[PDB]
Design a protein around this motif. Structure first.
Motif, PDB file in Angstrom:
ATOM      1  N   UNK A  87       6.775  -0.859  13.286  1.00 18.49           N
ATOM      2  CA  UNK A  87       7.680  -0.545  12.712  1.00 18.49           C
ATOM      3  C   UNK A  87       8.971  -0.516  13.100  1.00 18.49           C
ATOM      4  N   UNK A  88      10.668  -1.207  11.683  1.00 18.82           N
ATOM      5  CA  UNK A  88      11.400  -0.602  12.561  1.00 18.82           C
ATOM      6  C   UNK A  88      12.206   0.653  12.838  1.00 18.82           C
ATOM      7  N   UNK A  89      11.626   1.212  11.737  1.00 15.38           N
ATOM      8  CA  UNK A  89      12.325   2.333  12.143  1.00 15.38           C
ATOM      9  C   UNK A  89      11.320   3.619  12.628  1.00 15.38           C
ATOM     10  N   UNK A  90      10.140   3.500  12.921  1.00 16.48           N
ATOM     11  CA  UNK A  90       9.600   5.019  13.688  1.00 16.48           C
ATOM     12  C   UNK A  90       9.018   4.305  14.835  1.00 16.48           C
ATOM     13  N   UNK A  91       8.436   3.126  14.770  1.00 18.33           N
ATOM     14  CA  UNK A  91       8.431   2.692  16.033  1.00 18.33           C
ATOM     15  C   UNK A  91       6.690   1.983  16.050  1.00 18.33           C
ATOM     16  N   UNK A  92       5.953   2.903  14.631  1.00 17.59           N
ATOM     17  CA  UNK A  92       4.751   2.668  14.836  1.00 17.59           C
ATOM     18  C   UNK A  92       4.006   1.793  15.292  1.00 17.59           C
ATOM     19  N   UNK A  93       2.938   1.363  15.464  1.00 15.00           N
ATOM     20  CA  UNK A  93       2.380  -0.162  16.248  1.00 15.00           C
ATOM     21  C   UNK A  93       0.848  -0.375  15.094  1.00 15.00           C
ATOM     22  N   UNK A  94       1.089  -1.368  14.853  1.00 15.96           N
ATOM     23  CA  UNK A  94      -0.836  -1.545  14.221  1.00 15.96           C
ATOM     24  C   UNK A  94      -1.476  -2.471  13.859  1.00 15.96           C
ATOM     25  N   UNK A  95      -2.328  -3.066  13.737  1.00 19.13           N
ATOM     26  CA  UNK A  95      -3.602  -4.496  14.357  1.00 19.13           C
ATOM     27  C   UNK A  95      -2.270  -5.173  12.138  1.00 19.13           C
ATOM     28  N   UNK A  96      -2.181  -6.465  12.245  1.00 18.93           N
ATOM     29  CA  UNK A  96      -2.083  -7.078  11.205  1.00 18.93           C
ATOM     30  C   UNK A  96      -2.811  -6.277   9.955  1.00 18.93           C
ATOM     31  N   UNK A  97      -4.136  -6.310  10.446  1.00 16.52           N
ATOM     32  CA  UNK A  97      -5.518  -5.874   9.532  1.00 16.52           C
ATOM     33  C   UNK A  97      -4.846  -4.818   9.458  1.00 16.52           C
ATOM     34  N   UNK A  98      -4.291  -3.907  10.345  1.00 19.32           N
ATOM     35  CA  UNK A  98      -4.692  -2.471   9.241  1.00 19.32           C
ATOM     36  C   UNK A  98      -3.479  -1.985   8.871  1.00 19.32           C
ATOM     37  N   UNK A  99      -2.492  -2.668   8.888  1.00 21.15           N
ATOM     38  CA  UNK A  99      -0.976  -2.031   7.982  1.00 21.15           C
ATOM     39  C   UNK A  99      -1.066  -2.225   7.028  1.00 21.15           C
ATOM     40  N   UNK A 100      -2.308  -2.013   5.554  1.00 20.15           N
ATOM     41  CA  UNK A 100      -1.752  -1.849   4.195  1.00 20.15           C
ATOM     42  C   UNK A 100      -2.821  -0.694   4.208  1.00 20.15           C
ATOM     43  N   UNK A 101      -3.380   0.076   5.225  1.00 19.11           N
ATOM     44  CA  UNK A 101      -4.526   1.464   5.260  1.00 19.11           C
ATOM     45  C   UNK A 101      -3.693   2.482   6.400  1.00 19.11           C
ATOM     46  N   UNK A 102      -2.514   2.294   6.690  1.00 17.36           N
ATOM     47  CA  UNK A 102      -2.215   2.502   7.845  1.00 17.36           C
ATOM     48  C   UNK A 102      -1.199   4.045   6.248  1.00 17.36           C
ATOM     49  N   UNK A 103      -0.936   5.092   7.055  1.00 15.22           N
ATOM     50  CA  UNK A 103      -0.926   6.635   5.857  1.00 15.22           C
ATOM     51  C   UNK A 103       1.199   6.151   5.891  1.00 15.22           C
ATOM     52  N   UNK A 104       2.025   6.042   4.322  1.00 19.00           N
ATOM     53  CA  UNK A 104       2.825   4.784   4.040  1.00 19.00           C
ATOM     54  C   UNK A 104       4.267   5.945   4.038  1.00 19.00           C
ATOM     55  N   UNK A 105       4.057   7.161   5.347  1.00 21.31           N
ATOM     56  CA  UNK A 105       5.465   8.100   4.861  1.00 21.31           C
ATOM     57  C   UNK A 105       5.672   8.224   6.031  1.00 21.31           C
ATOM     58  N   UNK A 106       6.933   7.229   6.682  1.00 26.48           N
ATOM     59  CA  UNK A 106       7.843   7.174   7.949  1.00 26.48           C
ATOM     60  C   UNK A 106       8.537   8.020   8.039  1.00 26.48           C
TER      61      UNK A 106
END
Ligand SMILES: CCCCCCC(=O)OC[C@H](COP(=O)(O)OCC[N+](C)(C)C)OC(=O)CCCCCC
Ligand SMILES: CC(=O)O[C@@]12C[C@@H](C)[C@@]3(O)[C@@H](C=C(CO)C[C@]4(O)C(=O)C(C)=C[C@@H]34)[C@@H]1C2(C)C
Ligand SMILES: [Zn+2]
Ligand SMILES: [Zn+2]
Length: 52
Positions: A33-52
């Motif tokens: 994430x450009x803004x908070x620096x969280x790191x995720x698998x490509x396939x996990x992107x759509x599943x992460x909680x989306x409050x940055x």
């Protein structure tokens, strides 16, 4: 606000902040994430909680 994920190349071992497993591989191992620096698998992107 949503996260802003970009494909990213890790130079030290990094775990996916969503699912807990290693971001495996030599290049393009996951997304950062450009803004908070969280790191995720490509396939996990759509599943992460989306409050940055
Ligand atoms: C679910 C899909 C599994 C399919 C099989 C994958 C496999 O066994 O080896 C191939 C991938 C390729 O390495 P790459 O870094 O080129 O990219 C593959 C992963 N990604 C697309 C996320 C960047 O090679 C490696 O991971 C290298 C291991 C490096 C660790 C050094 C101890
Ligand atoms: C200084 C350093 O560590 O160089 C590394 C080599 C290997 C050993 C890694 O440390 C790697 C970083 C990632 C991202 O998590 C995944 C791995 O490639 C992986 O799958 C495993 C088993 C170890 C990781 C990075 C680089 C630059 C390839
Ligand atoms: Zn974020
Ligand atoms: Zn994951």
């Amino acid at each position: 606000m949503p996260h802003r994920f970009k494909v990213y190349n890790y130079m030290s071992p990094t775990f996916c902040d969503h699912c807990g497993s290693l971001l495996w591989g030599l290049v393009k191992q996951g997304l950062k994430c450009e803004d908070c620096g969280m790191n995720v698998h490509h396939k996990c992107r759509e599943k992460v909680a989306n409050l940055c």
